[PDB]
Paper text:
The structure of CD200RLa was solved after phase determination using crystals soaked in gadolinium chloride solution because molecular replacement (MR) phasing was unsuccessful. Despite CD200RLa sharing a high amino acid sequence identity with CD200R in the V-like domain (84% identity in residues 1–123), it gives minimal binding to CD200 (50-fold lower affinity; Wright et al., 2003). Comparison of the CD200R and CD200RLa sequences does not show simple changes in the contact residues that might explain why the activating receptor CD200RLa does not bind CD200, implying indirect effects. To investigate this, the structure of the V-like domain of CD200RLa was superimposed onto CD200R in complex with CD200. Residues 63 and 66 in the C′C″ loop differ between CD200R and CD200RLa and are at the periphery of the interaction with K63, making contact with F96 and L30 of CD200. Substitution of F114 for Leu in CD200RLa seems to cause the side chain of F36 to flip in the opposite direction into the core of the domain. This in turn leads to the destabilization of the NH2 region of CD200RLa and therefore disruption of the CD200 binding interface. Thus both regions are important in explaining why the CD200RLa does not bind CD200 and this argument was strengthened by the analysis of a CD200RLa triple mutant combining both regions (N63K, K66T, and L114F) that binds CD200 with a similar affinity as CD200R.
CD200R is a member of a “paired receptor” family as in addition to this inhibitory receptor there is one very closely related gene with activating potential in humans and several in mice (Akkaya and Barclay, 2010; Wright et al., 2003).
Author numbering: 18 to 205
Write the structure that this text describes.
């Protein structure tokens, strides 16, 4: 329930801090990783016996470094499969402690822009997470179509037409939390 929401972009490295203190007497540290559909996996470290185990092979999930006073999980390269709950269960001589992360994966859209026939322009934001928002300058008569994909990404495709014959150059803004992208299009 009490958790840290964390947003990480595709292909970037993510670091999930369990705690950072020389005072916490951790005997065993376990990360439990849960997904909506994908099966769960675990990385565990025995600080007493200096031994470790993993059921996360092929998921690019490891200990950032050997855990001591700053136990930290590392995702070397974030991918859609990484979205889920990351729970750090700490066993100390006094009892149990926990740190929960809710990891969200952001996918930047792949954009394209092009003029069409009869003073139309097309702006597309391919497979973004969340869906990108497309806006035009100046205002046109547009049709925007969004397609949700099974991986959680959304493709947005916009086609406009401008009445005013004083309009020769149009601008498309593709807004996204990972960064805005805009380009101007010369009408036919
Ligand atoms: C994390 O906390 C937020 C805000 O309270 C909540 O919306 C979300 O569902 C929680 N997630 C988990 C995995 O507990
Ligand atoms: C964890 O286990 C793997 C496989 O047994 C090992 O290669 C790795 O060095 C261990 N990690 C740490 C932080 O000791
Ligand atoms: C693991 O990450 C590396 C880059 O650090 C990447 O080349 C590889 O394809 C990734 N493997 C999986 C299964 O995600
Ligand atoms: C998500 O699905 C779309 C549509 O199949 C695909 O174009 C895109 O490459 C996928 N995204 C990722 C990050 O796998
Ligand atoms: C991206 O564009 C939107 C819409 O104009 C704006 O609200 C937002 O501040 C922009 N983001 C950045 C980082 O400039």
């Amino acid at each position: 329930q009490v958790n840290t929401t964390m947003s990480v972009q595709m292909d970037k490295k993510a670091l999930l801090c369990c705690f950072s203190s020389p005072l916490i007497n951790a005997v065993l540290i376990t990360w439990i990783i849960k997904h909506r559909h994908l099966p769960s996996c675990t990385i565990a470290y025995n600080l007493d016996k200096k031994t470790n185990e993993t059921s996360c092979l092929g998921r690019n999930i490891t200990w950032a470094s050997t855990p001591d006073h700053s136990p930290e999980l590392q995702i070397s390269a974030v991918a859609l499969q990484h979205e889920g709950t990351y729970t750090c269960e700490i066993v100390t001589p006094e009892g149990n402690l926990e740190k929960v992360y809710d990891l969200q994966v952001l996918v930047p859209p792949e954009v394209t822009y092009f003029p069409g026939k009869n003073r139309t322009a097309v702006c597309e934001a391919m497979a973004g997470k969340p869906a990108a928002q497309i806006s035009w300058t100046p205002d046109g008569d547009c049709v925007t179509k969004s397609e949700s994909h099974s991986n959680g990404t959304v493709t947005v495709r916009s086609t406009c037409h401008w009445e005013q014959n004083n309009v020769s150059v149009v601008s498309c803004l593709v807004s996204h939390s990972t960064g805005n992208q805009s380009l101007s299009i010369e009408l036919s």
